[PDB]
UniProtKB/Swiss-Prot annotation, chain B:
Its EC number is 3.6.4.6. The chain holds residues 217 to 737 of 744 of the full protein. Required for vesicle-mediated transport. Catalyzes the fusion of transport vesicles within the Golgi cisternae. Is also required for transport from the endoplasmic reticulum to the Golgi stack. Seems to function as a fusion protein required for the delivery of cargo proteins to all compartments of the Golgi stack independent of vesicle origin. Interaction with AMPAR subunit GRIA2 leads to influence GRIA2 membrane cycling. Homohexamer. Interacts with GABARAP and GABARAPL2. Interacts with GRIA2. Interacts with PLK2, leading to disrupt the interaction with GRIA2. Interacts with MUSK; may regulate MUSK endocytosis and activity. Interacts with CDK16. Signal peptide: none annotated. It comes from Cricetulus griseus (Chinese hamster). Its main location: cytoplasm. It is found in: Cytoplasm. This is Vesicle-fusing ATPase.
Length: 484, 488
């Protein structure tokens, strides 16, 4: 019953279905009158440690098959030849079967990361023309869709198993085996707690866990010449579902220069709570319109932080620079798929107008990306999962023409400072100019109208700070004069 | 007379053309003075268990053929070889026959995955032996190929493979035959499941291939094995397919269901059902087209889907934007084409196109749309299924105007409007059916809305309800009202 962390119910059923029908001795099979299943295939997100499962299963099924491994290329060596080889590893099994056929020989052959002749070659050998039973094959692949349809049908590959990311209880199981092994030997860390580690991590693949423990071991080794596990949590992943990177996007934090910002956050909070509640629709779409510049992206990022979903991934142009419309679309699809994988998914789209490549002249924009996006907002996550979409548009007006705007469920304005009060409020929270300086600025704005973002303001501020301590204030007022 | 589930009449024809000529003894052939046909080819959709049929024919035609099996690859070995090997395999039966030609030896060679077989010269080589200048009669070849089109024309042609067999998905009676044999074998031994009925399983399944059908049964004994350490079969029905047809799925598309908030929705559903009946009964016209036009958030896709459960057709599939992202006009065309082909393959079926305006790639500015997909759509829309075949197609749109200017609208036989709620009380009715709010607040809303005018789509409305819930109990309704007014 060891060792494989998590995957016990699914594993149990799959195990039963392939193995139990074979196992009952011996009249039972005739009574069943069912040909033994030919193969079981598992398709999983990358990094799920499918392979460990396969080695264990192969070992478990027979005293000795004894295991056969197939290189991914399979058909490597062009001249005749290789294709024949793909026929050949099977050939040994078929030969054994003709020689002893009836009972009781089982051969296991496995192809990792599974065109022309080889397709047909495998299909013919696995099923038909005559017999070919008494052997089983398991295929491990990152994506189901890539693979050919014909293999899939019940028969040659009747059962297809999808391996989910570990359950928290399951996550606790993967960590639990390694930890238990550490437990059995005297050395252990008292501070570290299994329940605590489990509660802390939702997203991680098995691998991720073994990786974390291993890193903790390295850290421990290092100390001799929470604890190490806590330090590993602090660094080691690189999870790809962790979103440590997202926090960095905002260089200057969020400044409460005024009430509207707070309103944006309680609103963001409401959106998060709603998506958390889970009735009806699990998908919500938001686009927030603000004057060019300010923390459009920053606000979105803070909302994402607030949400605390297991999976947060930010789709932005910068990652995608120079890509063909098709390449960008592929990347986007990839990220959304990854988001589908998590039970809870949070996604943000960065400068949506930029993605489309809208150009005011023309107007020319890349249609393929827009349609893909519209389908995606329209698209609904597979059951049991809730997805959060955040979109930031510099200007809505383009979008209203687009009809993009209709698709989005809710829209939040994020206006630039329009009053002297909010202005000084910003200078104060930012704490840049002196009390005297700020008093002067106030005496030069209070009662007057303004129209400037926060980031743009930050810029003007540093630009004014460069000038001598006697020219800073005047310079500032000289800048605010141009940015009206 | 065993064993092959379904495929009996066709089986009789396949049997009859090759076997009848050869079997009659012996003057009959000379009186006919007709040369025996060389080979039979059957081409089928995947999973029809064609291979089982081949095995049966191989067992059945001769006491010993002796059966010959050909690897798909055929052409393996660069060094000599493949051409030579192919000729060698062809040659032996012929040599036996030349040695004894007259009577009484017939030789059967079986071919699997012909498309791989038929590259360059090696394909040419096969052709020569069958159509060979001297004799070569009394040799029988059967080829199983998933796709007919790929194979060279000369093989299809009378002579080497005069007869071409097309194998249809199992008939319900036939489906009953495939299930019936395994079940019967189970019947013969004492163990059986009393609850399970063959007719019931058959009525439940229309679409499935015979191999797949065996597979559910395979699932079922296994479930029984689990049990020892309807019934199990019912569970298998729940998770055996993987049908590749219908895939129940609709609940996933129809997430919240179809409540009866209004008079119009019922009329529309009924209309759809009447049209379904009409499809089922009209012989003059093979193809039926319908289009649903509504303001955005109407629920048009869900309604179309609802109609699809209602038809109860053997094969139901939905053509979706969601499925296709990032493709190029030609890729969209291929996918659409294949799906519609799949519909032709079934005897009668309903195919639903969802968000057509989106499907085209259309955007309001320009306007910009991708032409190739659209043309594909129109030709497909005009088009008539192979005779004796009926297809039901549903189109979902909100941009009717654009379609009308386009001339898209004209192709459709009929259009049914699917209007957003216009009376506030009707909207209230939707609320009690959904049953979300408590009695008093609903009364307050009723006081607020009665007598006033509204334009709310149903999905959009539910979303508004969800938005309303999030606020505190004494902050739920006012929030809702504010959303409605803002939406105004
Ligand atoms: N839940 C788990 N059960 C078993 N092994 C796991 C699990 N999570 C991670 N692993 C690790 O993963 C390995 C086997 O699965 P693996 O992650 O290799 O699948 P994979 O998709 O091939 O991985 P990768 O894509 O990172 O190469 C084992 O060595 C084990 O350390
Ligand atoms: N009150 C605040 N609101 C928003 N951002 C703030 C605030 N205080 C400091 N910042 C910092 O300002 C940055 C905002 O940049 P952002 O691009 O989001 O603004 P923008 O006007 O949308 O610019 P762009 O037009 O390039 O999108 C963030 O990195 C954030 O950390
Ligand atoms: N209607 C049916 N009649 C006979 N056999 C069936 C039927 N449905 C399923 N089968 C099973 O399927 C097998 C024959 O169909 P098979 O899957 O070989 O056709 P195929 O399309 O050539 O398969 P593939 O293309 O996947 O290799 C038999 O072993 C039989 O048990
Ligand atoms: N009478 C009705 N007609 C349609 N949908 C209804 C009805 N009553 C309740 N609903 C619910 O509303 C939802 C409508 O979903 P659907 O995706 O069809 O909307 P839609 O027209 O596609 O919206 P959009 O076209 O803007 O994406 C379904 O979950 C359905 O259960």
């Amino acid at each position: 019953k060891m060792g494989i962390g998590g995957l016990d119910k699914e594993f149990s059923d799959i195990f039963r279905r392939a193995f139990a029908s074979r196992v009952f001795p011996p009249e039972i099979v005739e009574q069943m009158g069912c040909k033994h299943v030919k193969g079981i295939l598992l398709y999983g997100p990358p990094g799920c440690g499918k392979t460990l499962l396969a080695r264990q299963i192969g070992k478990m099924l027979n005293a000795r098959e004894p295991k056969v491994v197939n290189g991914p290329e399979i058909l490597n060596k062009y001249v005749g030849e290789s294709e024949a080889n793909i026929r050949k590893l099977f050939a040994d099994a078929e030969e054994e079967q003709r020689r002893l056929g009836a009972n009781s020989g089982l051969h296991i052959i496995i192809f990792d990361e599974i065109h022309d002749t080889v397709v047909n070659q495998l299909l013919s050998k696995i099923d038909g023309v005559e017999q070919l039973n008494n052997i089983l094959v398991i295929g491990m692949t990152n994506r189901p869709d890539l693979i050919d349809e014909a293999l899939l049908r019940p028969g040659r590959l009747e059962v297809k198993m999808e391996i989910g990311l570990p359950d928290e209880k399951g996550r606790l199981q993967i960590l639990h085996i390694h930890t238990a092994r550490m437990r059995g030997h005297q050395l252990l860390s008292a501070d570290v707690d299994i329940k605590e580690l489990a509660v802390e991590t939702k997203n991680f693949s098995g691998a991720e866990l073994e990786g974390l423990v291993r890193a903790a071991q390295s850290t421990a080794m290092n100390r001799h010449i929470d604890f190490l596990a806590s330090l590993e949590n602090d660094i080691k992943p690189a999870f790809g579902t962790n979103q440590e990177d997202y926090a960095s996007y905002i260089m200057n934090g969020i400044i409460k220069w005024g009430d509207p910002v707070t309103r944006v956050l309680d609103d963001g909070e409401l959106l998060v709570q709603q998506t958390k509640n889970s009735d009806r629709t699990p998908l919500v779409s938001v686009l927030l319109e603000g004057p060019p510049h300010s923390g459009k992206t920053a606000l979105a990022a803070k909302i994402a932080e607030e949400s605390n979903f297991p999976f947060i991934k930010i789709c932005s142009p910068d990652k995608m620079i120079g890509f063909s419309e098709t390449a960008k679309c592929q990347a986007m699809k990839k990220i959304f798929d990854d988001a589908y994988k998590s039970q809870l998914s949070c996604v943000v789209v960065d400068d949506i107008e930029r993605l489309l490549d809208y150009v005011p002249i023309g107007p020319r924009f890349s249609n393929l990306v827009l349609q893909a996006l519209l389908v995606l907002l329209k698209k609904a996550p597979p059951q049991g999962r809730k997805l959060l979409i955040i979109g930031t548009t510099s200007r809505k007006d383009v979008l209203q023409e687009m009809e993009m705007l209709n698709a989005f469920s809710t829209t939040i304005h994020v206006p630039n400072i329009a009053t002297g009060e909010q202005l000084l409020e910003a200078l104060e929270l930012l704490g840049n100019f002196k009390d005297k300086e700020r008093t002067t600025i106030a005496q030069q704005v209070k009662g007057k109208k303004v129209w400037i973002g926060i980031k743009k303001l930050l810029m003007l501020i540093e630009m004014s700070l460069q000038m001598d301590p006697e020219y800073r204030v005047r310079k500032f007022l000289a800048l605010l004069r141009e940015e009206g």
